[PDB]
Amino acid sequence: MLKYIIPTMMLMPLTWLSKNSMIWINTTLHSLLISLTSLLLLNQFGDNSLNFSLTFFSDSLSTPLLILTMWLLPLMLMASQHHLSKENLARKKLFISMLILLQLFLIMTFTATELIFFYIMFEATLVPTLIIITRWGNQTERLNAGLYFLFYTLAGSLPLLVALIYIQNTMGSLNFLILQYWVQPMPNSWSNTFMWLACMMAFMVKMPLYGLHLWLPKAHVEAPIAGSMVLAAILLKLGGYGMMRITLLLNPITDFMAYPFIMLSLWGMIMTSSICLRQTDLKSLIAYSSVSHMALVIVAILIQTPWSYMGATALMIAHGLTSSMLFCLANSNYERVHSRTMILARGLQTLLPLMAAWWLLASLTNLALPPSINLIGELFVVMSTFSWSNITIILMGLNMVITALYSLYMLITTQRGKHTHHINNILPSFTRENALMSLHMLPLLLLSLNPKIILGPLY
Amino acid sequence: SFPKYEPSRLASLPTTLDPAEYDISSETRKAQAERLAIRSRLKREYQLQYNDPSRRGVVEDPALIRWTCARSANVYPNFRPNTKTSLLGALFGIGPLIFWYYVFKTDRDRKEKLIQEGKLDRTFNISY
Amino acid sequence: AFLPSAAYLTHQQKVLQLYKRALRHLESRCVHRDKYRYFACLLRARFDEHKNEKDMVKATQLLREAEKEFWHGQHPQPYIFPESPGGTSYERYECYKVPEWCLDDWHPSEKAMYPDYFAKREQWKKLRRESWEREVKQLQEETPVGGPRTEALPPARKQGDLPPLWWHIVTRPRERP
Amino acid sequence: SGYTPDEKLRLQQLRELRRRWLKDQELSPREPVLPPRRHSIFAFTHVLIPVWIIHYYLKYHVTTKPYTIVEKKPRIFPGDTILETGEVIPPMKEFPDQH
Amino acid sequence: DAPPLTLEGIKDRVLYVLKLYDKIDPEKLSVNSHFMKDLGLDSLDQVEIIMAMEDEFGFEIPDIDAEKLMCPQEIVDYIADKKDVYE
Amino acid sequence: ITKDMLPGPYPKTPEERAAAAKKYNMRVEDYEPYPDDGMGYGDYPKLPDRSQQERDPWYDWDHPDLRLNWGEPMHWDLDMYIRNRVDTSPTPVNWNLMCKHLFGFVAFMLFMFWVGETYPTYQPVGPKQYPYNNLYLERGGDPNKEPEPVVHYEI
Amino acid sequence: AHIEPRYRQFPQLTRSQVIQAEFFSATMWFWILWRFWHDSDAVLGHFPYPDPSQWTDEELGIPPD
Amino acid sequence: SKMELPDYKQWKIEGTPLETVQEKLAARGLRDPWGRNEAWRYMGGFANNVSFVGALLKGFKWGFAAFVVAVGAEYYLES
Amino acid sequence: GAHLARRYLGDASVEPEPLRMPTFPPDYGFPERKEREMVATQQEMNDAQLVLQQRDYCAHYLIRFLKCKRDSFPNFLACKHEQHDWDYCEHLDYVKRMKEFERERRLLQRKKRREQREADMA
Numbered sequence A: 001m002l003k004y005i006i007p008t009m010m011l012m013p014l015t016w017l018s019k020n021s022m023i024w025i026n027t028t029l030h031s032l033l034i035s036l037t038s039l040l041l042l043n044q045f046g047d048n049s050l051n052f053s054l055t056f057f058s059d060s061l062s063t064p065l066l067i068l069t070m071w072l073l074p075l076m077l078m079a080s081q082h083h084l085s086k087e088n089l090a091r092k093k094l095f096i097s098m099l100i101l102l103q104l105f106l107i108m109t110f111t112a113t114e115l116i117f118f119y120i121m122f123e124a125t126l127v128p129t130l131i132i133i134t135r136w137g138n139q140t141e142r143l144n145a146g147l148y149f150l151f152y153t154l155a156g157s158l159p160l161l162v163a164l165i166y167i168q169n170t171m172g173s174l175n176f177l178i179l180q181y182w183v184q185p186m187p188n189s190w191s192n193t194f195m196w197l198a199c200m201m202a203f204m205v206k207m208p209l210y211g212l213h214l215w216l217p218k219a220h221v222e223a224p225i226a227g228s229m230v231l232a233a234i235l236l237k238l239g240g241y242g243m244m245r246i247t248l249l250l251n252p253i254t255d256f257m258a259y260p261f262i263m264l265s266l267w268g269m270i271m272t273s274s275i276c277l278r279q280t281d282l283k284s285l286i287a288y289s290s291v292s293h294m295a296l297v298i299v300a301i302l303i304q305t306p307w308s309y310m311g312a313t314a315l316m317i318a319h320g321l322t323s324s325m326l327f328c329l330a331n332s333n334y335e336r337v338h339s340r341t342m343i344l345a346r347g348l349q350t351l352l353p354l355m356a357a358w359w360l361l362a363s364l365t366n367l368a369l370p371p372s373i374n375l376i377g378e379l380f381v382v383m384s385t386f387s388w389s390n391i392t393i394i395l396m397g398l399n400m401v402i403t404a405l406y407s408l409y410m411l412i413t414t415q416r417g418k419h420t421h422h423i424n425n426i427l428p429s430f431t432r433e434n435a436l437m438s439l440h441m442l443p444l445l446l447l448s449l450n451p452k453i454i455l456g457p458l459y
Numbered sequence B: 001s002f003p004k005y006e007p008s009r010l011a012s013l014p015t016t017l018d019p020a021e022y023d024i025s026s027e028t029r030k031a032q033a034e035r036l037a038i039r040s041r042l043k044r045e046y047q048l049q050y051n052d053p054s055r056r057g058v059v060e061d062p063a064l065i066r067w068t069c070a071r072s073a074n075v076y077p078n079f080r081p082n083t084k085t086s087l088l089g090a091l092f093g094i095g096p097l098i099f100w101y102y103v104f105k106t107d108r109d110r111k112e113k114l115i116q117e118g119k120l121d122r123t124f125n126i127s128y
Numbered sequence C: 001a002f003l004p005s006a007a008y009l010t011h012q013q014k015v016l017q018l019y020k021r022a023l024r025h026l027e028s029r030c031v032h033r034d035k036y037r038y039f040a041c042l043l044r045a046r047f048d049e050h051k052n053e054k055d056m057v058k059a060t061q062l063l064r065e066a067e068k069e070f071w072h073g074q075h076p077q078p079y080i081f082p083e084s085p086g087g088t089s090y091e092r093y094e095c096y097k098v099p100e101w102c103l104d105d106w107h108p109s110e111k112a113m114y115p116d117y118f119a120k121r122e123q124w125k126k127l128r129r130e131s132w133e134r135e136v137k138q139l140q141e142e143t144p145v146g147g148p149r150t151e152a153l154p155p156a157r158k159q160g161d162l163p164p165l166w167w168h169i170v171t172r173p174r175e176r177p
Numbered sequence D: 001s002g003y004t005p006d007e008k009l010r011l012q013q014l015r016e017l018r019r020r021w022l023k024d025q026e027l028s029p030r031e032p033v034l035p036p037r038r039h040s041i042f043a044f045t046h047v048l049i050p051v052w053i054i055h056y057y058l059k060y061h062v063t064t065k066p067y068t069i070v071e072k073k074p075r076i077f078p079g080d081t082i083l084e085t086g087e088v089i090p091p092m093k094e095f096p097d098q099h
Numbered sequence E: 001d002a003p004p005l006t007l008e009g010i011k012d013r014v015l016y017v018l019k020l021y022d023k024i025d026p027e028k029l030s031v032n033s034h035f036m037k038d039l040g041l042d043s044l045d046q047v048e049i050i051m052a053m054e055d056e057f058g059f060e061i062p063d064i065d066a067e068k069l070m071c072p073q074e075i076v077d078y079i080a081d082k083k084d085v086y087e
Numbered sequence F: 001i002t003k004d005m006l007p008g009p010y011p012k013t014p015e016e017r018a019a020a021a022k023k024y025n026m027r028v029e030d031y032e033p034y035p036d037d038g039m040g041y042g043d044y045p046k047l048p049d050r051s052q053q054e055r056d057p058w059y060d061w062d063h064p065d066l067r068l069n070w071g072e073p074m075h076w077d078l079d080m081y082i083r084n085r086v087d088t089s090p091t092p093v094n095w096n097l098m099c100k101h102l103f104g105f106v107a108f109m110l111f112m113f114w115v116g117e118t119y120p121t122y123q124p125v126g127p128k129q130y131p132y133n134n135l136y137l138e139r140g141g142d143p144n145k146e147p148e149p150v151v152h153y154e155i
Numbered sequence G: 001a002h003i004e005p006r007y008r009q010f011p012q013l014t015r016s017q018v019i020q021a022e023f024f025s026a027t028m029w030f031w032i033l034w035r036f037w038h039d040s041d042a043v044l045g046h047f048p049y050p051d052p053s054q055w056t057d058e059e060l061g062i063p064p065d
Numbered sequence H: 001s002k003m004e005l006p007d008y009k010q011w012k013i014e015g016t017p018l019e020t021v022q023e024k025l026a027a028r029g030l031r032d033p034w035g036r037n038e039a040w041r042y043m044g045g046f047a048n049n050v051s052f053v054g055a056l057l058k059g060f061k062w063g064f065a066a067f068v069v070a071v072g073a074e075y076y077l078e079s
Numbered sequence I: 001g002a003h004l005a006r007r008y009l010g011d012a013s014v015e016p017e018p019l020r021m022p023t024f025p026p027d028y029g030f031p032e033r034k035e036r037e038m039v040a041t042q043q044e045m046n047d048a049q050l051v052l053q054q055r056d057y058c059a060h061y062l063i064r065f066l067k068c069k070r071d072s073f074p075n076f077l078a079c080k081h082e083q084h085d086w087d088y089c090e091h092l093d094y095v096k097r098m099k100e101f102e103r104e105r106r107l108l109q110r111k112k113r114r115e116q117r118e119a120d121m122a
């Protein structure tokens, strides 16, 4: 994995030794070249994972997340070069360096064969995200959003480290390749109960879980566009990856332990969809939809069946792409009308036809229209949770209706009806914005042709 | 004689059947007078700010910003924990969670108990 | 009691609106023209019987009982004109009513396809921007203390000037764009 | 009540301006000044070429793989003759006629 | 479909509908003839005239605009403004 | 915008009530805030709770799509009472009579369906007779187990 | 060329559509009459219905005692 | 563009049920001033509409003739 | 249709039920009854791909009709005579079923008369 870390670190001498106004072009070009070279991680075998050295290894689970991250960085640079045109050159270089550092920590998180190294990078992703949210946001509440985002996550992750250190004093090693062969059954006791809680609550917090999700509507709607992309599409998958790595050591105590969290997520999807039915803000609507989808992924991981794991990783990739597209749509509308109210700018189909087409396509992929990978993941999770119990399908099925009750609603209030009369600064769609939405959507529509590369490490 | 209309929550009383509309007292006429005055002043301000040729942007409505701020950021400072709010929160937060936990635990226990004795039909169920 | 120019509905307007609604619902009740004409003459007799009633509270009670009578026997699905609100064709063409200011955002390559129209548009914009301050000074010197009382706008009382706030009403999109 | 004279004058002037604006919406005969720039084509480029393409695809790439195109067997009636090996299916038993 | 309407056509149609009314004798009315004073009509007759024009032209006139229409020239101008004639 | 135009706590003194009524651009006598039961509403007014379909459609509204003016105070549930959503128009028939009629109709036809299921209708024929022991081999039966001989006789 | 609209009189008709409408109505009635003449069994009844009470006792195997 | 209108004087209610309405009102005691406006629907080419049974039997004559001709033709060819 | 009124509004102990027939033995009252004969062979019925409900006691007429329909393409109205033969055969089968129903009803009535006579003598 040294062939991907070194160009990412060399991106900083590229962005600091560049010209007065050539930073965006050079960074976008070289990050797109890194994204092109990222496809060499598809050397996967049916039995063996790809092991590079004693520190870095790549299974079939970390590979789609790595490709998504290195694909997301140029899109991020394209998205965050319109509201920073008035910024200082040094501050612009600092923002680009923050994005590069965050991407470096993200691609070093997924390949870590040691759980301590994985945890270290998993908390090292906090500092650039917090700095971006608290510095380059727009509202006042970002300062409050800098606290709820931080002290939630550490409150889940500081006990967990202790539990990880306990494994270092118990099994003798924390290497994931070793622990696949030296694993032991976990007997039912209060000590193993609290060790399960310590090892899981960090990933329930960072996913998030219903009840612990309070930081996500606050850290999504004050953050800038790049921060919204990094929270929605990547940083919510660290919890899922950590769950999938750590569920191996927590057997067979998980069978009777996962019940309250399964009930919490199965009711939280309905609660967050109902909240989406009455939200007055576009950004908060997208945040609560993200909460609902990640609660679904939590259920899929907790029931731990192969179909559930496949649906979980497919849902993770599909939700990341769809939420990134929806956040970029919301950012374009916010840049055009200078407000976040849903009811303010109506009837935009009569003014922007192509943006209306992009809105319709994104809302189509949000409610999991087949044969998109959203439907693939959600369908497989539904099959697995029907195998788990025969009643949960009801708690799935009703949720589906509410999804189709808000996404199209998020379309209609923003696209259809009579246009407002007192708004006359509606510019035509720029080429950069349309390029951004096409680069967001065309991989998502192309992945329906060959979904076997995003179906987890047990395909 | 004729069946009188019963007002409902989702079926309001007709405007032409309202007895209070037919009052021709002085106070109702005065109230309509300053209601029309307030509406006319607001409309005049809006259409003066709206027909400006130099303006190219959004005519900001303080009512919309007021409503959006009251809906989201002004809920907790106006909240006091009392009997009604605690009862509603206990009924709506942990009620359905307990109900669904009991339902799913009972169903899973029955299914597992059927599985151990071999009564459950699993002749072809090999994908899980 | 919601009017653009007035603050209330008088007795005469209430009687006239009740008569119009009753005649429309009666036309909806009987399909054919001759039966509708017969019963419309009957209703005209019923309204003309109590025309010269100088007792005001008796007129009010007659209005209340006539409104109850109309509410008792109105059609469940009355006839609605297609362009009337609640009709089949109501607000259908609002998806084609593009506002005029979008023409300000057109590219110069596609602005050269209609030269004379855009020349006339530039003349219209010059007229509006040269009459705006005159009409806003007319408005600010005619509105009484404490704001306007009604929503009625004053006309153009001078020679050469335009009525105030004339742009968005004159340049509205047509009903069939 | 009828038309108040002040708003009657306003309506008259507004109508005159609206009529002038509607008159200005017409086009000159020059506008729009545009920038300067086989009977069986549909039976060939829309039927014959896709038929060739997918007949090649079915003959040499679908039927190559096993169990892709599976067909219901043809119906065999008494009195018929098999083309594959020439066997004749014997006719049925003599009917106990009723009419 | 939907043939265009001119001011001459609208004035001819409103004069036709008013001429087919038995309360108005055809030899006295003019296009600028008031209903209440020049012709001696009634408010109910004004409502009947308004709904007759509504049924003739196939579109509904609101009551707040119907109460201020009292002369055929006003009706012609109102229908002309609503239908956007003379373009 | 400024600080003393945003909503605040529940008004208690009449001067605070008058200031809140002036802030919300209506009369003091028509300014009725939500009751201070601790539900979080604050000083937001309690509008008469009717849908936007009941508004005048012929009025020159500032927002004719939603039938709302500029600067007028919005309902707390304005996103519920839009024309795309729940309507509270006055029905020609009372609500209780409609509900009772619909429930009686559904219940009566369900009861009569159950009664007709109890007593079905048919035609005066016997069971259909199929050859070869009721087609034992054709019903997927195993050829090793010889079926019980079922013989049908001519009538 | 086209049909000019008329005011409160009968509309101008085309001979071709009148001929086509009469031809299609005549074809419908001819088809109905022809099928009723030839088939005639799908309406009135394909087969006679015997009376169940008319069957004799000895052909039903009723033992007389 | 120029639509000429027919004469207003021909629209009389004679031969129409509007005179039946007029007789009923005159027996009761009132007037019907709008008969001449609606007189155009009951006179001219819109008068004497067919009944329902005559509507269902549209084109029955030619169809019966064609059926008789075809039956005779098939009787000739069957011999 | 009168049998529904005789069974529901009358007495159900005499009217036979369609769910289970016959209750009387087939050799009771019938001296040396004869069984129905199958003409179509099981193999011929098998390779003709007949529907299982279509495999009644005279499916040979159906086989002949299907062969004629297949061999007279595209004249779809050529040989309706085979269809008429098949319809006549299934009508005869329905007549046989009606005869069986009437036999069961008459035997049930006879049994009721027998027990009524036993009640009379005792």
Ligand SMILES: *C(=O)CCCCCCCCCCCCC
Binding pocket: F121, F122, I001, I002, I003, I004
């Ligand atoms: C014998 O009377 C029973 C017939 C079948 C059950 C009743 C069917 C009723 C509907 C069909 C006949 C309608 C006659 C007008």
